[PDB]
Amino acid sequence: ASAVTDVLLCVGNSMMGDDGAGPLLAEKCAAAPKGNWVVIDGGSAPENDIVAIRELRPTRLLIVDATDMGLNPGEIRIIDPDDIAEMFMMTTHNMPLNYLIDQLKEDIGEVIFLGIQPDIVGFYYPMTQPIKDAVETVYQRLEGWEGNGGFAQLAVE
Amino acid sequence: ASAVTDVLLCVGNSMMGDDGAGPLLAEKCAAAPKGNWVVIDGGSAPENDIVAIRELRPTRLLIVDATDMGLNPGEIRIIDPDDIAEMFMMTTHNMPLNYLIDQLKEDIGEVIFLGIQPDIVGFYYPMTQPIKDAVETVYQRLEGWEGNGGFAQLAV
Ligand SMILES: [Ca+2]
Ligand SMILES: [Ca+2]
Ligand SMILES: [Ca+2]
Ligand SMILES: [Ca+2]
Numbered sequence: 001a002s003a004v005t006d007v008l009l010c011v012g013n014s015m016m017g018d019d020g021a022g023p024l025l026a027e028k029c030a031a032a033p034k035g036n037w038v039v040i041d042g043g044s045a046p047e048n049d050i051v052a053i054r055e056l057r058p059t060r061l062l063i064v065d066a067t068d069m070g071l072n073p074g075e076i077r078i079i080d081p082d083d084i085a086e087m088f089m090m091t092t093h094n095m096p097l098n099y100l101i102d103q104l105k106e107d108i109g110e111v112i113f114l115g116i117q118p119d120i121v122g123f124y125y126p127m128t129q130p131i132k133d134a135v136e137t138v139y140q141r142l143e144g145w146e147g148n149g150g151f152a153q154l155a156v157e
Numbered sequence: 158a159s160a161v162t163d164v165l166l167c168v169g170n171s172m173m174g175d176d177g178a179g180p181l182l183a184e185k186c187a188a189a190p191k192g193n194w195v196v197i198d199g200g201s202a203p204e205n206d207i208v209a210i211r212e213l214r215p216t217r218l219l220i221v222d223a224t225d226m227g228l229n230p231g232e233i234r235i236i237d238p239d240d241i242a243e244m245f246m247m248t249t250h251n252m253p254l255n256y257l258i259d260q261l262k263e264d265i266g267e268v269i270f271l272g273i274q275p276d277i278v279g280f281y282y283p284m285t286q287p288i289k290d291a292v293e294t295v296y297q298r299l300e301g302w303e304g305n306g307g308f309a310q311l312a313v
């Protein structure tokens with residue numbers, strides 16, 4: 001037995017400034033593990049991470065990604081899968097993200113999508129302080145995570 | 158309203174030899190429409206065609222794609238979603254195909270996946286005769302298509 005329960009999929013590109021939030025989280029976890037999470041350093045596209053996640057047979061999947069939500073830099077929100085669909089959130093390959101989330105939810109049964117608001121996103125940009133702070137905030141909630149980890153739902157109307 | 162019922166997604170790359178089966182079907186349809194199908198010339202990856210298919214609000218989606226099924230060149234089969242999953246069929250972006258099909262099934266209802274067996278797949282290869290023939294065969298069934306268009310299920 002693997003004894004796997006929780007899986008954390010970190011999405012992003014460290015070569016794209018604040019889009020590096022996900023890879024940064026993966027780096028922190030590698031250096032100092034928190035909780036029971038198996039952490040996937042997913043990079044730019046979640047599509048090619050799906051097969052591994054399903055094979056891990058998790059009970060709970062957390063996805064962390066820098067995502068423009070129209071908020072102040074570094075704000076953290078959980079995005080409801082219905083709002084993922086309504087917002088037309090896309091992967092880098094222009095796949096609608098709700099397709100992946102909704103299907104994962106059928107196989108896993110708790111799937112949480114967590115967005116962190118970037119400020120600057122561009123090739124070889126540095127990460128800004130509010131995003132570094134947000135990544136620390138999420139990291140510190142990984143141990144003993146329950147529900148939505150105490151984070152607010154994104155308000156989309 | 159658009160009055161749309163049937164959508165045909167053609168998958169493939171004309172610059173990859175027998176992988177051009179899908180694009181060829183799109184070309185035939187554009188030149189001489191068959192049935193009520195709205196035909197999407199989907200190219201290499203179906204991922205970026207999903208939003209348009211969903212917006213079209215079809216009741217039935219037929220997907221046509223050159224796919225290695227371990228059969229003789231030009232053989233045509235319908236691949237059941239269970240088998241798509243078990244085979245670990247992948248898109249060009251390594252997205253499992255079964256996730257895409259299963260979610261389309263929720264949004265559309267009836268989703269049919271038709272595979273055509275290629276022989277040769279390579280950059281700037283020609284298409285081989287059995288695959289040309291297979292594309293013609295599928296084309297001729299589009300008008301008045303019912304069920305799985307008379308094609309056999311892939312045995313795997
Ligand atoms: Ca990936
Ligand atoms: Ca991102
Ligand atoms: Ca499913
Ligand atoms: Ca501790």
Ligand SMILES: [Ca+2]
Nearest residue numbers: 199200202206
């Ligand atoms: Ca496409």
Ligand SMILES: [Ca+2]
Nearest residue numbers: 230275276277
């Ligand atoms: Ca061959």
